[PDB]
Structure 1
Amino acid sequence: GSHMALSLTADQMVSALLDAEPPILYSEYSMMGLLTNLADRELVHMINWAKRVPGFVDLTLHDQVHLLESAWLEILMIGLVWRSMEHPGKLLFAPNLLLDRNQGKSVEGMVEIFDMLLATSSRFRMMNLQGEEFVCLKSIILLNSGVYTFEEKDHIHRVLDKITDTLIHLMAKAGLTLQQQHQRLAQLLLILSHIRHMSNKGMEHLYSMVVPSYDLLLEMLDAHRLHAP
């Protein structure tokens, strides 16, 4: 059978998001080349993951591609900062690609982006971000980042409301007071503004020096239909 997104309980939402989680990939081996190769491989898995975020396949294909084109670098970044949280001062791009600030100095313009990513990872560490919170934030990014550069918009907002309910549930079951739930919610959501900022400055840097286009993402999203179950 199939669950419609708005019917899911918080436990079904959490389970759906955990089961959709992509794998941790390895670097295949210049720093930019490694980071580009890794991003390209991550993107394949990201398509598979997006298709499994409750609500996403309710949208038309052209709206799917809108959302993913807006969000893909933020998505890459949040998963990076997540994985990096237990390595203070380092970015765990892969288990065999743990880079420090000084290594970021090898590409002109890169240290400023490395520094921002690091500040984010350290902020998640200090908040003790949990895996089940992470997955909710990541799915938020996907449905939100492109929501305002477009009845159907209502649906995405209702899905977003379900994810917020889900984060609140997690926080209430972890023993936070109603007031602490609201504060922690707000703190996590304001970090999302910083992720957007990092993605904007990242895009500018990539364009200053090939990035996933609209057309590429469209094709990838479409091609997913042909993959073996």
Structure 2
Amino acid sequence: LALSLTADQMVSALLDAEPPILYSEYDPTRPFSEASMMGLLTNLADRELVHMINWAKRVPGFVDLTLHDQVHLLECAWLEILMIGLVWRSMEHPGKLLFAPNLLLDRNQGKCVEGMVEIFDMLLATSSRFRMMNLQGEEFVCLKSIILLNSGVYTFLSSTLKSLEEKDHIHRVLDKITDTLIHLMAKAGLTLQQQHERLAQLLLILSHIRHMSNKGMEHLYSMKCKNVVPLYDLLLEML
């Protein structure tokens, strides 16, 4: 049915599906600590996550898919999706990251966590690029839905007939979203050359976002290894 939507419909749909911007259960009453910040960013994420599931369902063609496939799409893309959102919100705040309205960290405040400055710089850089290209919200939502539908497809066990028809559907929506991007740029008045040139710059960024994502994934799990679970503690209680 999404395959029916005209460009203008594809835009409103997406725009309305946009999730609420959440607040960090952040408390200035207390100081920031390596682990303090991690759980802070972590809770914000586990909560945005919940809203992400509501959003994914609102995206054209998404629910046309199989439960399994939906879970595989959201399980390969969740962190890219958070990152692009974080990036979008951080545009108006040069040099900083608006994780949430009440949580605005600048570069440095990143060092308040082991090896997470690198991921901050990249995120700052990305937000900076979006700014310099004057990314529009209409453009933004197209890209978020692309990331959903596209980062998990090469990693589908395409061994059976339902899996491949599953993939075609995915690529048709993707083309439909590309049609939309082009329309938005046509409308904005760019020539056809600028059009294809801008579709390319936007898409090539999704690459750097996949990158940050993998970096993030690495840095996140290494945290879950460290400060994972004591023992000297439960034991002392018991004795």
TM over 0.5: yes
Deviations 1:164-186 (A, max 9, x none): 00000000000000010000000
Contact 1:90–1:98, Cα closer than 8 Å, also in 2: yes
Report the 3-state secondary structure (helix = DSSP H, G, I; strand = E; otherwise coil) of the residue aligned with 1:5.
coil
Deviations 1:172-227 (A, max 9, x none): 0000000100000000000000000000000000111199999999999xxxxxxx
Identity %: 98
Q: Which has the larger radius of gyration?
A: 2
Q: Return the TM-score normalized by structure 1.
A: 0.90
Going from structure 1 to structure 2, the CA distance change for 1:142 and 1:213 (only over 3 Å counts) comes to farther
Going from structure 1 to structure 2, the CA distance change for 1:55 and 1:122 (only over 3 Å counts) comes to same
Matches within 5 A, 1:215-226: none
- Matches of 2:39 and 2:103, distance apart in 1: 12
Return 5+ residue gaps in structure 1 as ranges.
Answer: 221-229
- Matches of 2:15 and 2:236, distance apart in 1: 25
Going from structure 1 to structure 2, the CA distance change for 1:43 and 1:111 (only over 3 Å counts) comes to same
Contact 1:168–1:185, Cα closer than 8 Å, also in 2: yes
Contact 1:66–1:146, Cα closer than 8 Å, also in 2: yes
Report the 3-state secondary structure (helix = DSSP H, G, I; strand = E; otherwise coil) of the residue aligned with 1:8.
coil
Aligned residues, how many? 217
Return 5+ residue gaps in structure 2 as ranges.
Answer: 27-35, 157-164
Going from structure 1 to structure 2, the CA distance change for 1:148 and 1:129 (only over 3 Å counts) comes to same
Contact 1:90–1:118, Cα closer than 8 Å, also in 2: yes
Using CA pairs under 8 Å that are at least 6 residues apart, name the structure with larger relative contact order, 1 or 2. 1
- Matches of 2:176 and 2:237, distance apart in 1: 29
Match of 2:211 among 168, 187, 197: 197
Going from structure 1 to structure 2, the CA distance change for 1:154 and 1:211 (only over 3 Å counts) comes to farther
Q: CA deviation at 1:152?
A: 1.5
Going from structure 1 to structure 2, the CA distance change for 1:219 and 1:161 (only over 3 Å counts) comes to farther
